[PDB]
Design an enzyme around this catalytic site. Structure first.
Site, PDB file in Angstrom:
ATOM      1  N   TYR A  91       0.842  -1.188   0.000  1.00  0.00           N
ATOM      2  CA  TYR A  91       0.000   0.000   0.000  1.00  0.00           C
ATOM      3  C   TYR A  91       0.883   1.246   0.000  1.00  0.00           C
ATOM      4  O   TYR A  91       1.565   1.535   0.979  1.00  0.00           O
ATOM      5  CB  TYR A  91      -0.905  -0.048   1.235  1.00  0.00           C
ATOM      6  CG  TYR A  91      -1.621   1.240   1.556  1.00  0.00           C
ATOM      7  CD1 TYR A  91      -2.383   1.904   0.587  1.00  0.00           C
ATOM      8  CD2 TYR A  91      -1.566   1.778   2.842  1.00  0.00           C
ATOM      9  CE1 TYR A  91      -3.077   3.074   0.896  1.00  0.00           C
ATOM     10  CE2 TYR A  91      -2.254   2.946   3.164  1.00  0.00           C
ATOM     11  CZ  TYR A  91      -3.007   3.589   2.188  1.00  0.00           C
ATOM     12  OH  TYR A  91      -3.693   4.737   2.510  1.00  0.00           O
TER      13      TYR A  91
ATOM     14  N   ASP B 128      -1.309  -5.398   9.662  1.00  0.00           N
ATOM     15  CA  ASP B 128      -2.409  -4.495   9.339  1.00  0.00           C
ATOM     16  C   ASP B 128      -3.509  -5.371   8.742  1.00  0.00           C
ATOM     17  O   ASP B 128      -3.455  -5.745   7.568  1.00  0.00           O
ATOM     18  CB  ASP B 128      -1.956  -3.435   8.330  1.00  0.00           C
ATOM     19  CG  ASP B 128      -3.053  -2.440   7.991  1.00  0.00           C
ATOM     20  OD1 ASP B 128      -4.239  -2.748   8.223  1.00  0.00           O
ATOM     21  OD2 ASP B 128      -2.730  -1.348   7.477  1.00  0.00           O
TER      22      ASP B 128
ATOM     23  N   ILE C 157      -6.775  -4.653   8.227  1.00  0.00           N
ATOM     24  CA  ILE C 157      -7.934  -3.830   7.905  1.00  0.00           C
ATOM     25  C   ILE C 157      -8.863  -4.542   6.903  1.00  0.00           C
ATOM     26  O   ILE C 157     -10.055  -4.254   6.849  1.00  0.00           O
ATOM     27  CB  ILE C 157      -7.484  -2.451   7.334  1.00  0.00           C
ATOM     28  CG1 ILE C 157      -8.696  -1.538   7.117  1.00  0.00           C
ATOM     29  CG2 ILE C 157      -6.743  -2.646   6.015  1.00  0.00           C
ATOM     30  CD1 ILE C 157      -8.315  -0.124   6.675  1.00  0.00           C
TER      31      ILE C 157
ATOM     32  N   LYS D 198     -12.825  -0.334   5.500  1.00  0.00           N
ATOM     33  CA  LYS D 198     -13.009  -1.199   4.335  1.00  0.00           C
ATOM     34  C   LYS D 198     -14.113  -2.248   4.385  1.00  0.00           C
ATOM     35  O   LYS D 198     -14.796  -2.456   3.384  1.00  0.00           O
ATOM     36  CB  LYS D 198     -11.675  -1.870   3.998  1.00  0.00           C
ATOM     37  CG  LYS D 198     -10.499  -0.899   4.012  1.00  0.00           C
ATOM     38  CD  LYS D 198     -10.691   0.259   3.029  1.00  0.00           C
ATOM     39  CE  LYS D 198      -9.522   1.242   3.105  1.00  0.00           C
ATOM     40  NZ  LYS D 198      -9.527   2.252   2.004  1.00  0.00           N
TER      41      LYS D 198
HETATM   42  C1  LIG Z   1      -3.414  -1.678   4.325  1.00  0.00           C
HETATM   43  C2  LIG Z   1      -4.163  -0.361   4.549  1.00  0.00           C
HETATM   44  N1  LIG Z   1      -4.123   0.111   5.852  1.00  0.00           N
HETATM   45  C3  LIG Z   1      -4.705   1.241   6.290  1.00  0.00           C
HETATM   46  C4  LIG Z   1      -5.398   2.026   5.446  1.00  0.00           C
HETATM   47  C5  LIG Z   1      -6.072   3.323   5.929  1.00  0.00           C
HETATM   48  O1  LIG Z   1      -7.392   3.210   6.373  1.00  0.00           O
HETATM   49  P1  LIG Z   1      -8.129   4.143   7.446  1.00  0.00           P
HETATM   50  O2  LIG Z   1      -9.287   4.696   6.788  1.00  0.00           O
HETATM   51  O3  LIG Z   1      -8.577   3.247   8.573  1.00  0.00           O
HETATM   52  O4  LIG Z   1      -7.131   5.152   7.943  1.00  0.00           O
HETATM   53  C6  LIG Z   1      -5.520   1.629   3.997  1.00  0.00           C
HETATM   54  C7  LIG Z   1      -6.284   2.475   3.024  1.00  0.00           C
HETATM   55  N2  LIG Z   1      -6.356   3.738   2.957  1.00  0.00           N
HETATM   56  O5  LIG Z   1      -7.173   4.127   1.860  1.00  0.00           O
HETATM   57  C8  LIG Z   1      -7.530   5.522   1.942  1.00  0.00           C
HETATM   58  C9  LIG Z   1      -6.309   6.473   2.119  1.00  0.00           C
HETATM   59  S1  LIG Z   1      -6.602   7.811   3.360  1.00  0.00           S
HETATM   60  C10 LIG Z   1      -7.476   7.079   4.728  1.00  0.00           C
HETATM   61  C11 LIG Z   1      -4.910   8.036   3.933  1.00  0.00           C
HETATM   62  C12 LIG Z   1      -3.788   8.206   2.943  1.00  0.00           C
HETATM   63  O6  LIG Z   1      -4.216   8.817   1.674  1.00  0.00           O
HETATM   64  C13 LIG Z   1      -3.364   9.991   1.407  1.00  0.00           C
HETATM   65  N3  LIG Z   1      -4.330  10.911   0.793  1.00  0.00           N
HETATM   66  C14 LIG Z   1      -4.113  11.483  -0.441  1.00  0.00           C
HETATM   67  N4  LIG Z   1      -5.045  12.305  -0.743  1.00  0.00           N
HETATM   68  C15 LIG Z   1      -5.926  12.279   0.332  1.00  0.00           C
HETATM   69  C16 LIG Z   1      -7.169  13.009   0.555  1.00  0.00           C
HETATM   70  N5  LIG Z   1      -7.626  13.864  -0.339  1.00  0.00           N
HETATM   71  N6  LIG Z   1      -7.765  12.727   1.727  1.00  0.00           N
HETATM   72  C17 LIG Z   1      -7.298  11.848   2.660  1.00  0.00           C
HETATM   73  N7  LIG Z   1      -6.161  11.161   2.494  1.00  0.00           N
HETATM   74  C18 LIG Z   1      -5.533  11.423   1.316  1.00  0.00           C
HETATM   75  C19 LIG Z   1      -2.788  10.443   2.724  1.00  0.00           C
HETATM   76  O7  LIG Z   1      -1.768  11.352   2.684  1.00  0.00           O
HETATM   77  C20 LIG Z   1      -2.598   9.065   3.425  1.00  0.00           C
HETATM   78  O8  LIG Z   1      -1.346   8.478   3.187  1.00  0.00           O
HETATM   79  C21 LIG Z   1      -4.898   0.449   3.604  1.00  0.00           C
HETATM   80  O9  LIG Z   1      -4.900  -0.053   2.373  1.00  0.00           O
END
Ligand SMILES: Cc1ncc(COP(=O)(O)O)c(CNOCC[S@@+](C)C[C@H]2O[C@@H](n3cnc4c(N)ncnc43)[C@H](O)[C@@H]2O)c1O
Ligand SMILES: Cc1ncc(COP(=O)(O)O)c(CNOCC[S@@+](C)C[C@H]2O[C@@H](n3cnc4c(N)ncnc43)[C@H](O)[C@@H]2O)c1O
Lengths: 421, 421
Positions: free
Chosen positions: A133, A218, A220, A261
């Site tokens: 990821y 992890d 999730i 998720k």
């Molecule tokens: C294996 C795995 N583990 C954890 C997670 C995160 O899940 P949570 O929702 O519980 O925190 C994931 C999947 N994450 O998918 C969504 C990514 S966001 C939650 C965090 C991540 O995305 C970057 N990013 C880029 N642009 C963003 C905008 N516009 N909003 C939020 N986050 C955004 C961040 O910088 C960060 O690295 C998973 O696969």
């Protein structure tokens, strides 16, 4: 400003021209966003039938003031109890979790960083199997000063972790003068779409035991394992072994969870840290202060998750709809002569498009990727963005769009392979 | 584990024997918890009259799926708009905030740490006027590697910041070989209970301009200024001066806000970062990823705060009830011959109990403190816990308990001073 203060083409093109069944039928179809929009109806029906939680009411009485004031970083008792019950149910009740060892955080994003803060000092490192990821490159390293050393996995054995890959990773860290504090794995895997094998798990536990380091799993996607082989939590493997509170590794095996998720509630920011180490729980609890879960949300989900009928049916139905959608993507891809790594979990497939590359290079991969974006108007993730060592693999999500849009995507892709190949 | 992984008597005694009008009338009365329980009825009435937001409904339609999926770290547009409108209203609309420069975080706790992460590197420092909120010792330093250097304030001038105190602070940092990156102030002040003076503000702006450093103003209590002199936001002072986007300091003045104290919703974790520096906004936005505000909460509060009738009446009523409660505490204390630093904001008073100390020492302060806990069964905060340089001052909260319990506390304290003095 401090130092901290200082693969996007697919998305930028998406936002400019996003697909819509009626308002923009020529828009780019979103297949790179790993989100679950398959079971909201189940949650909406529950909410309609049980309106009190969202209304700040319990047994007819208002508890708004009480919730408004609840800011304890130990988390709402009833909610942590519901969460551990749910985590156990997900694992077929093969393992039980102590709510006193669970720490709530604002999403797994928060949980993962906190674990890094508690387990490694700036300048040290953690090993991570590739592909992985891409969010980890920022989440795990940005504010922690910790580095990532890859444990390379290849298609030869279905992208599984081997003893040799682990030692080579451990060796690379040494060459970079980095002290290794642990290994962080994703089980089930994003972007592989596969559940980790019992073999890999014992291989990992043996490795972390030998090196005297930590293992962070992890999980999730633990609730999204819809096909054989069975999902095996790292916590289960510990029980059926001398590691059952009879070793040392037991204290160094940790789990990260989230409701983003499986339940499809990423916006609510419900994450969790679980550790057998009393000191890690204490430390993480204090750290959660920087990212607590809203008490309004904690209350709502404690009510939802306390309903055993809802949790049981949701998991079964989520498994059914996910499996149905994955098969549709697999069959759709096969018609274009495109195979997938045999998977059984997640909200995506790891697609093999090596035979469509000009050459076996990442430059070729990015070439193909851009063609799919501009020609096919489909947004997917190039494997190199996930640090995959072999060019040609792509992550393709299937749980965020309507079945009909998925088919549309497949036929446009089929038109593409027949036109250029 | 990493290094990060590794004054409480009043509370521990409180939890063991907490006061209750009916279930434990001999329990210790809580007067050390700075929380606002004075206006929940106003929020409950609004919720009763406007049930749709909490029900995940908008204009009769369900938006549960949409909210469940909203996880963008730029925050919900409607909510950020409502927040900037509310922040302006709090400041009598004397200053306007750009929602594009606002960053939502899980409480001010999260916001403050994030600001430190964006403005100072490990090993550097920030100056903070004493006495100050003891939470800062962990919040600002723990995971940031940043140090705190005190700007000492004394009763001589009502605990105000002076040019000499600032230079002496700047000098201490140098002696400790620490590079100064900025000054963080609390306005209104916790635990002083006073609004910062226009004089102090210009003094601070001049200092940060000269030293080329940052000024972070934690204005979480901005909405609780109930008496003269008027509350002046750091942002207001910038406007009526050549700093109005005509200097450099403008880019280095930042504000932290939260809904924990005025609206009394600490459990919901609604915090905000505001900065004129484009780069700080961009950096903080990404950092908020580790502590986002639940979309369920964002929706609810965007609805509540969008109601101009509610916000107007809430601020007026909150001011009224707070002023009433503060006067009651001041009058109650006067009857025991105890004076308070003349204050006009906050949820507490800074109490002068120097004349009750065995001697002018902190050992004497802790002595008196323990007596009040065990003899009077009252829990308050000894000034040394807030790093006050002179023994004898105490922070006494008045917004978390019923008026009658407050009176009870006062008469027990009166019985105490007459018995030992
Ligand atoms: C294996 C795995 N583990 C954890 C997670 C995160 O899940 P949570 O929702 O519980 O925190 C994931 C999947 N994450 O998918 C969504 C990514 S966001 C939650 C965090 C991540 O995305 C970057 N990013 C880029 N642009 C963003 C905008 N516009 N909003 C939020 N986050 C955004 C961040 O910088 C960060 O690295 C998973 O696969
Ligand atoms: C000047 C000033 N600024 C910010 C804040 C924080 O407000 P937010 O609610 O917006 O984050 C405050 C006041 N904070 O009062 C409550 C303290 S909690 C939010 C954070 C703080 O408390 C420590 N702590 C100790 N025990 C805790 C339990 N059981 N739960 C939560 N937090 C707990 C933490 O370690 C942290 O330092 C303010 O005055």
């Amino acid at each position: 400003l401090s130092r901290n203060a200082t693969y996007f083409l697919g998305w930028q093109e998406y936002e400019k021209n996003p697909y819509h069944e009626v308002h923009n039928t020529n828009g780019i179809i979103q297949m790179g966003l790993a989100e679950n929009q398959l079971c909201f109806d189940l949650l909406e029906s529950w909410l309609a039938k049980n309106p009190e939680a969202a209304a700040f009411k319990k047994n007819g009485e208002s508890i708004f003031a009480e919730l408004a004031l609840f800011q304890d970083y130990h988390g709402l008792p009833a909610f942590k109890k519901a969460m551990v019950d749910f985590m156990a149910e997900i694992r077929g009740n093969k393992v039980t979790f102590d709510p006193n060892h669970l720490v709530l955080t604002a999403g797994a994003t928060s949980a993962n960083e906190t674990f890094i803060f508690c387990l490694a000092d700036p300048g040290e490192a953690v090993l991570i199997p590739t592909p992985y990821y891409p969010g980890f490159d920022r989440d795990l390293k940005w504010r922690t000063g910790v580095e990532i050393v890859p444990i390379h996995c290849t298609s030869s054995n279905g992208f599984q972790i081997t003893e040799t890959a682990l030692e080579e990773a451990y060796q690379e860290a040494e060459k970079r003068n980095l002290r290794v504090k642990g290994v962080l794995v994703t089980n089930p895997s994003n972007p592989l779409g596969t559940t980790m094998t019992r073999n890999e798990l014992y291989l990992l536990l043996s490795f972390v035991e030998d090196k005297g380091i930590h293992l962070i799993s992890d999980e999730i996607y633990s609730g999204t394992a819809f096909s054989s082989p069975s999902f095996i939590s790292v916590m289960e493997v510990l029980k059926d072994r001398n590691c059952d509170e009879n070793s040392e590794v037991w204290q160094r095996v940790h789990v990260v969870y989230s409701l983003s998720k499986d339940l499809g509630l990423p916006g609510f920011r419900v994450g969790a840290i679980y550790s057998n180490d009393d000191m890690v729980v204490a430390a993480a609890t204090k750290m959660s202060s920087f990212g607590l879960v809203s008490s309004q949300t904690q209350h709502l989900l404690s009510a939802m998750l306390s309903d055993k009928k809802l949790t049981k049916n949701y998991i079964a139905e989520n498994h059914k709809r996910l499996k149905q959608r994955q098969k549709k993507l697999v069959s759709g891809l096969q018609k274009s002569g495109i195979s997938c790594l045999n998977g059984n979990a997640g909200l995506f497939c790891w697609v093999d498009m090596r035979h469509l590359l000009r050459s076996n290079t990442f430059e070729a991969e990015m070439e193909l990727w851009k063609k799919i974006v501009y020609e096919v108007h489909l947004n997917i993730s190039p494997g190199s963005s996930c640090h995959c060592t072999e060019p040609g693999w792509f992550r393709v999500c299937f749980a965020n769009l309507p079945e009909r849009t998925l088919d549309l995507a497949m036929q446009r892709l089929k038109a593409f392979v027949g036109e250029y190949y």
